Amino acid sequence: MAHRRYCKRTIPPGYKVDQVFGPRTKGKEGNFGDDKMNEEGIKDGRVTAMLNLVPSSHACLFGSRVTPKLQPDGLHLKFEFTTVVPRDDPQFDNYVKICDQCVDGVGTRPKD
Amino acid sequence: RRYCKRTIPPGYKVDQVFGPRTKGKEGNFGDDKMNEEGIKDGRVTAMLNLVPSSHACLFGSRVTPKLQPDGLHLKFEFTTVVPRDDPQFDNYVKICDQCVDGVGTRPKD
C-alpha cells in the first residue's frame, strides 16, 4: 500500500505479487515467483518457506555488500545479500526445488 | 537457513553479530563508530528505513541462486532509490559516505 516506502511494502492477504512488486521478470528485479506464486501471493506455502532465507533488516544492512551509486535522479543504494543453505541442511532439497520453480519462473507452473 | 535472521541486540557491536566490517565485500557497511555503537548509533535507525522488508527483498529483488559444493548460495540484490530532491537525500548520502567501506574511519569532518 501506497503510503509506505516501496521497500517497506508487504503483500497483504488476497493480493498477487505483481500487485505490490510488479510483474515477474527474468534476470532482473522481481524475478522471484512463478505464475502460481504470483497468483497465490502469501497463500503459496513455498513463500513462507522462502522467507526463512530472507535477511532480517539488520542482516540486510550489516551482512550484505552495500553499494551506493549517485545518479542524476538521486542515490541508488544496492544491498546484495547471499544466504547460504548448507548441502546437508534438512531443507536444502526443498529450497533448491522452490528456487528452481520460481527464480525466473514467469510463464511456468509447478507439479512434476 | 538462520544467520540471515540475526539481529543486533543492545550492547552488541555490529562485528559481534555480522563479522568485522569490510571494504567492497559482504559486511562492508559501518564505520568504526557505527560498528562500536550498534543499534545505539542514530545513523543505523535512518539507514534501516531504506532496507527492504521480507516480502520486498524476496519479490522486489533480483534473486540469483548458485549451487556450489558447500550448498545453495541465494543472492538477493535489492536497490533502494532516494530521490535527489528528497528532504532526507543529503543525510542518506553523508551516512553512506561515512559507513560504506567505512571500516577504519570515524565521523567528524
UniProtKB/Swiss-Prot annotation, chain B:
Can you say where in the cell this protein is located? Virion; Host endoplasmic reticulum-Golgi intermediate compartment; Host Golgi apparatus
Which segments carry the region annotation Disordered? 14-35
Q: Tell me which residues make up the CoV N CTD domain.
A: 1-107
S-S bonds: C96-C99
* PTM section of the record: ADP-ribosylated. The ADP-ribosylation is retained in the virion during infection.
Annotated segments matching region Dimerization: 2-109
- Regions of compositional bias (Basic and acidic residues) in chain numbering: 23-35
Top-level taxonomic group: Viruses
Please give the subunit comment from the record. Homooligomer. Both monomeric and oligomeric forms interact with RNA. Interacts with protein M. Interacts with NSP3; this interaction serves to tether the genome to the newly translated replicase-transcriptase complex at a very early stage of infection.
Family membership, please give it.
Answer: Belongs to the gammacoronavirus nucleocapsid protein family.
Q: What does this protein do?
A: Packages the positive strand viral genome RNA into a helical ribonucleocapsid (RNP) and plays a fundamental role during virion assembly through its interactions with the viral genome and membrane protein M. Plays an important role in enhancing the efficiency of subgenomic viral RNA transcription as well as viral replication.
The protein, known as: Nucleoprotein
Q: Which organism is it from?
A: Avian infectious bronchitis virus (strain Gray) (IBV)
Describe which stretch of the whole protein the shown chain covers, with first residue, last residue and complete length.
225 to 333 of 409
